[PDB]
């Protein structure tokens, strides 16, 4: 069994840097975690919990997968991000359209997490993702999601005037999850094998 201290469920799944009940920290970069209560209920009836890599960070040869960091998630005094998820940003002056698909060939259900960044203002949208008007498409055999980033200035939480929205689903065996985005995509690197 894995008993957590201080760090939240959302925090541990995403890989909050200071993280390694009442949690002091939920999300280091401010935002929301959709269907959080439902996820906790689901993570209750589990016989086996295991972490797996499904999309290697190095597989992003056209995008920048390490430079994107925030002061909201510090590590050793300097800026950092969630370990298990990837903050993709523009490489050079370009952010090519992402078309990526992972198929679950395991015998167990996979817990996949992903997110969208709602930037502070228009100037920041261009700075991070280059493209002004962007979208995120997440598809499975049972899931159809299309996201548009809401560009707005919000009150500073952990020094941030922007927000992030995180989503999750259960990928069945032999089912594949598909991603398409031209910006604001916080891409999964690690998923979780679960057993009822």
């Amino acid at each position, epitope marked *: 069994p894995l008993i957590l201290r201080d760090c939240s469920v959302a925090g541990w799944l995403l890989g909050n840097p200071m993280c390694d009940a009442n949690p002091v920290n939920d999300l280091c970069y401010p935002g929301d975690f959709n269907d959080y209560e439902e996820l906790k209920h689901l993570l209750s009836r589990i016989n086996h919990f295991e972490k797996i890599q499904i999309i290697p960070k190095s597989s992003w040869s056209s995008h920048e997968a390490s430079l994107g960091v925030s*002061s909201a998630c510090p590590y050793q005094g300097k800026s950092s991000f969630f370990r298990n998820v990837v903050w993709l940003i523009k490489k050079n002056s370009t952010y090519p359209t992402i078309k990526r698909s992972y198929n679950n060939t395991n015998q167990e259900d996979l817990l996949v997490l992903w997110g969208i960044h709602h930037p502070n203002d228009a100037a920041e949208q261009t700075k991070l993702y280059q493209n002004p008007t962007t979208y995120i498409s997440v598809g499975t055999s049972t899931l159809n999601q299309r996201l548009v980033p809401r560009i707005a200035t919000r009150s500073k939480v952990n020094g941030q005037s922007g927000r992030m929205e995180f989503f999750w689903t259960i990928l069945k065996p032999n089912d594949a999850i598909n991603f398409e985005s031209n910006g604001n995509f916080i891409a999964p690197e690690y998923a979780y094998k679960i057993v009822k």
Partner: antibody
Amino acid sequence: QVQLQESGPGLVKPSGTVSLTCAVSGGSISSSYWWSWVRQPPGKGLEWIGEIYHSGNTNYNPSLKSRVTISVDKSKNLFSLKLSSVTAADTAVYYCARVALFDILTGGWFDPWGQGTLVTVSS
Amino acid sequence: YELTQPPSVSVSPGQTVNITCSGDTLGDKYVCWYQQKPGQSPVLVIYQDTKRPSGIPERFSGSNSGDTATLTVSGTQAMDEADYYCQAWDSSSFVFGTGTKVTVLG
């Protein structure tokens, strides 16, 4: 308002060691800021020497890493600079500054700066 | 990593002056700008590409795109005559530009 103050000798013989200290007022060293040293030879550009965090973690200019050391005193709310094996090329005005991290992306900005202090290296 | 600046630029009082800063893939980095007058310490005028510190006149503005960052001073004044430096960060090192001397033509 935060104020920073450099202090030290100002005259150093060749092959000797430049030893400077930066007093921090209006704020605490134990912050999310980084503390840096920058020098400028007369009529020339600024050159980053290095930086330190209140935990003791440091980062130096690769070209100076051989002969530079930076420490920090959380109790006395100051941090210091040691530059050994000095030459005529080390004659410069030395600044200490406070560095703050961007909300997003690597790097940071320098504010505020100290008044600076001249160190002359000549035998 | 090198940040390249023109050594000097001229501008008539009231006019607009441009100060350029060049480096590899600078458009992905946040750039800051400092004003230094003879015998004084550097002063932050622009941080995070376009942001102004409190107490800095609105006529100062900045921008970044491609491999070139630009500090812009419109309606320039005599007290704006100084050296200007850009700065960025790369591979555990902070980097300052070579510096640009701005003369207001008197």
